[PDB]
Amino acid sequence: MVVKAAGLVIYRKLAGKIEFLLLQAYPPHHWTPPKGHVDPGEDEWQAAIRETKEEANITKEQLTIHEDCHETLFYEAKGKPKSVKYWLAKLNNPDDVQLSHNWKWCELEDAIKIADYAEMGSLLRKFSAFLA
């Protein structure tokens, strides 16, 4: 049985534009939204929230999570089949966010380009249409 992981596609709306938060990850350091392995006694939802805290330093009260917008990707990688379930979540106040000074805010096209992963590109387009 597949290994389970979860995360959130974080977005913001600034100056009329929708931008997605991407983080540069362990070799080979691909760029992806915040995510990680589901722990014992958690479901995917709980895990997406916890991983967003650990990886992006964004906490639950800063977000509105869209329960009706989610998708699951399948990674066949280094031998270990793994699924990653994502929900779309809005950073409500972009003026109050504590990120390090390995991350970027990206509009759809640019996001696809640096994610450089066909399936993630398809997911981001699905979430963009949901927002429209």
CSV table of C-alpha atoms in Angstrom, one decimal:
chain,number,residue,atom,x,y,z
A,1,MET,CA,0.0,0.0,0.0
A,2,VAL,CA,1.1,3.4,-1.1
A,3,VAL,CA,2.6,5.8,1.3
A,4,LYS,CA,0.4,8.7,2.1
A,5,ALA,CA,1.3,12.4,2.1
A,6,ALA,CA,-0.7,15.6,2.1
A,7,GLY,CA,-0.3,19.4,1.7
A,8,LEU,CA,-2.0,22.6,0.8
A,9,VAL,CA,-1.8,24.7,-2.4
A,10,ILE,CA,-1.5,28.1,-0.7
A,11,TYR,CA,-2.6,31.1,-2.8
A,12,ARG,CA,-2.9,34.8,-2.4
A,13,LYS,CA,-4.8,37.5,-4.2
A,14,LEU,CA,-2.6,40.6,-4.7
A,15,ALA,CA,-3.4,43.5,-7.1
A,16,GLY,CA,-6.0,41.4,-8.8
A,17,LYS,CA,-3.6,38.5,-9.5
A,18,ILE,CA,-3.8,35.0,-8.1
A,19,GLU,CA,-0.3,33.8,-7.1
A,20,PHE,CA,0.7,30.3,-5.7
A,21,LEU,CA,3.3,29.8,-3.0
A,22,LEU,CA,6.1,27.4,-4.1
A,23,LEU,CA,9.0,26.1,-2.0
A,24,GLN,CA,12.3,24.6,-3.1
A,25,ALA,CA,12.6,21.2,-1.4
A,26,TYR,CA,16.0,17.0,-0.2
A,27,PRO,CA,17.7,16.1,-3.5
A,28,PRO,CA,16.7,16.9,-6.2
A,29,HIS,CA,15.0,19.9,-4.6
A,30,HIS,CA,12.0,20.4,-6.9
A,31,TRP,CA,9.7,23.3,-6.3
A,32,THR,CA,6.3,22.4,-4.8
A,33,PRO,CA,3.6,23.7,-2.5
A,34,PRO,CA,4.1,22.8,1.2
A,35,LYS,CA,3.6,19.0,1.9
A,36,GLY,CA,4.8,15.9,3.7
A,37,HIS,CA,4.1,12.4,5.1
A,38,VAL,CA,0.9,11.7,7.0
A,39,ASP,CA,1.6,10.6,10.7
A,40,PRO,CA,0.0,7.9,12.8
A,41,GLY,CA,-3.4,8.9,14.0
A,42,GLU,CA,-3.9,11.7,11.5
A,43,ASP,CA,-6.0,11.9,8.4
A,44,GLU,CA,-4.9,13.7,5.2
A,45,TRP,CA,-6.6,17.0,6.2
A,46,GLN,CA,-4.8,17.2,9.6
A,47,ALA,CA,-1.5,16.3,7.9
A,48,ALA,CA,-1.9,19.0,5.2
A,49,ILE,CA,-2.4,21.6,7.9
A,50,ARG,CA,0.6,20.3,10.1
A,51,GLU,CA,2.9,20.1,7.1
A,52,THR,CA,2.0,23.7,6.0
A,53,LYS,CA,3.1,24.8,9.5
A,54,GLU,CA,6.4,22.9,9.4
A,55,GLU,CA,7.4,23.6,5.8
A,56,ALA,CA,6.0,27.1,5.2
A,57,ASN,CA,5.6,28.6,8.7
A,58,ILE,CA,2.0,29.4,8.0
A,59,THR,CA,-0.6,28.4,10.7
A,60,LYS,CA,-4.2,27.4,10.3
A,61,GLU,CA,-5.8,30.6,11.6
A,62,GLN,CA,-4.2,32.6,8.7
A,63,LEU,CA,-6.0,30.5,6.1
A,64,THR,CA,-9.4,29.8,4.6
A,65,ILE,CA,-9.2,26.1,3.3
A,66,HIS,CA,-11.6,25.2,0.4
A,67,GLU,CA,-13.0,21.8,1.5
A,68,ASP,CA,-14.6,21.4,-2.0
A,69,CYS,CA,-11.3,21.9,-3.9
A,70,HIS,CA,-8.9,19.1,-3.7
A,71,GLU,CA,-6.9,16.6,-5.8
A,72,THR,CA,-4.5,13.8,-5.3
A,73,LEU,CA,-1.3,13.2,-7.2
A,74,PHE,CA,0.6,9.9,-7.5
A,75,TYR,CA,4.5,10.0,-7.3
A,76,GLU,CA,6.4,6.9,-8.4
A,77,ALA,CA,9.7,8.0,-7.1
A,78,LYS,CA,13.0,6.3,-6.0
A,79,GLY,CA,10.9,3.2,-5.9
A,80,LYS,CA,8.4,4.3,-3.2
A,81,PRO,CA,4.8,4.8,-4.6
A,82,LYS,CA,3.4,7.7,-2.8
A,83,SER,CA,0.2,9.7,-3.1
A,84,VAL,CA,0.0,13.4,-2.2
A,85,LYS,CA,-3.4,14.9,-1.5
A,86,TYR,CA,-3.8,18.7,-1.7
A,87,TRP,CA,-6.5,21.2,-0.8
A,88,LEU,CA,-6.6,24.7,-2.0
A,89,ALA,CA,-6.2,27.3,0.7
A,90,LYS,CA,-6.3,31.2,0.7
A,91,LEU,CA,-3.7,33.3,2.7
A,92,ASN,CA,-6.3,35.8,3.9
A,93,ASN,CA,-3.9,38.6,4.8
A,94,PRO,CA,-0.9,38.7,2.6
A,95,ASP,CA,0.3,41.7,4.6
A,96,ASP,CA,1.0,39.4,7.6
A,97,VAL,CA,3.1,36.3,6.6
A,98,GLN,CA,6.3,35.1,8.2
A,99,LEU,CA,8.5,33.5,5.5
A,100,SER,CA,12.3,33.0,5.7
A,101,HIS,CA,15.0,35.2,4.3
A,102,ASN,CA,13.9,29.3,-0.8
A,103,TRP,CA,10.4,30.4,-1.8
A,104,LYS,CA,8.5,32.2,-4.5
A,105,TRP,CA,5.0,33.6,-5.2
A,106,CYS,CA,4.1,32.6,-8.8
A,107,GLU,CA,1.2,33.3,-11.2
A,108,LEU,CA,-0.1,30.2,-13.0
A,109,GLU,CA,2.2,30.1,-16.0
A,110,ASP,CA,5.4,30.8,-14.0
A,111,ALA,CA,4.3,28.3,-11.5
A,112,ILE,CA,4.0,25.5,-14.1
A,113,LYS,CA,7.3,26.4,-15.5
A,114,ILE,CA,9.3,26.0,-12.3
A,115,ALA,CA,7.3,23.1,-10.9
A,116,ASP,CA,8.4,21.4,-14.1
A,117,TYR,CA,6.1,18.4,-13.4
A,118,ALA,CA,3.2,17.6,-15.8
A,119,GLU,CA,0.8,16.3,-13.1
A,120,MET,CA,1.3,19.3,-10.8
A,121,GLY,CA,0.7,21.6,-13.8
A,122,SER,CA,-2.6,19.9,-14.4
A,123,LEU,CA,-3.5,20.3,-10.7
A,124,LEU,CA,-2.7,24.0,-10.6
A,125,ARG,CA,-4.9,24.6,-13.8
A,126,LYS,CA,-7.8,22.7,-12.1
A,127,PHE,CA,-7.5,24.9,-9.0
A,128,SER,CA,-7.3,28.1,-11.1
A,129,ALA,CA,-10.5,27.2,-12.8
A,130,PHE,CA,-12.2,26.5,-9.4
A,131,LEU,CA,-11.1,30.0,-8.4
A,132,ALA,CA,-12.6,31.6,-11.6
